[PDB]
Design a binder for this molecule. Structure first.
Ligand SMILES: [Cl-]
Ligand SMILES: [Cl-]
Ligand SMILES: [Cl-]
Ligand SMILES: [Cl-]
Ligand SMILES: [Cl-]
Ligand SMILES: [Cl-]
Ligand SMILES: [Cl-]
Ligand SMILES: [Cl-]
Ligand code: NA
Length: 129
């Protein structure tokens, strides 16, 4: 499913991301826009053989099992295909573990390069929340 900007903001708020570990809702919507263009079915293969999955591009090296990333972990305890669903529950639950791991939202390269330090409130302007 490809979300609209306010539709995804509302779904993230409902699942408890707004100010989760000090990151306001606009940070999460900005990261989803640049990682996947709001498409739950996005995949991308990395040079090391791992793959990134879903609206927040979560990586199979550490976080989920895809049966093809030898010697990797599965810290979220889920098959990576669960991250491609139109229901964002599995993606959101796994992102809360990643953001808690010590490096905050710097775990997402597009957030560090395109959202960090910008006016992120803009991503939720006009939405009914
Ligand atoms: Cl947009
Ligand atoms: Cl915000
Ligand atoms: Cl594997
Ligand atoms: Cl393959
Ligand atoms: Cl594991
Ligand atoms: Cl599996
Ligand atoms: Cl949802
Ligand atoms: Cl932090
Ligand atoms: Na894995």
């Amino acid at each position: 499913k490809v979300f609209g900007r306010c539709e995804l903001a509302a779904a993230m708020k409902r699942h408890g991301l707004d100010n989760y570990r000090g990151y306001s809702l606009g940070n999460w919507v900005c990261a989803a826009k640049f990682e996947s263009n709001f498409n739950t079915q996005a995949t991308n293969r990395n040079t090391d053989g791992s793959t990134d999955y879903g609206i927040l591009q979560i990586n199979s090296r550490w976080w989920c099992n895809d049966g093809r990333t030898p010697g990797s972990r599965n810290l979220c305890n889920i098959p990576c295909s669960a991250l491609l669903s139109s229901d964002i529950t599995a993606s959101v639950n796994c992102a809360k573990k990643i953001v808690s791991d010590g490096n905050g939202m710097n775990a997402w390269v597009a957030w560090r390069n395109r959202c960090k330090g910008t006016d992120v409130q803009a991503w939720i302007r006009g939405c009914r929340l």
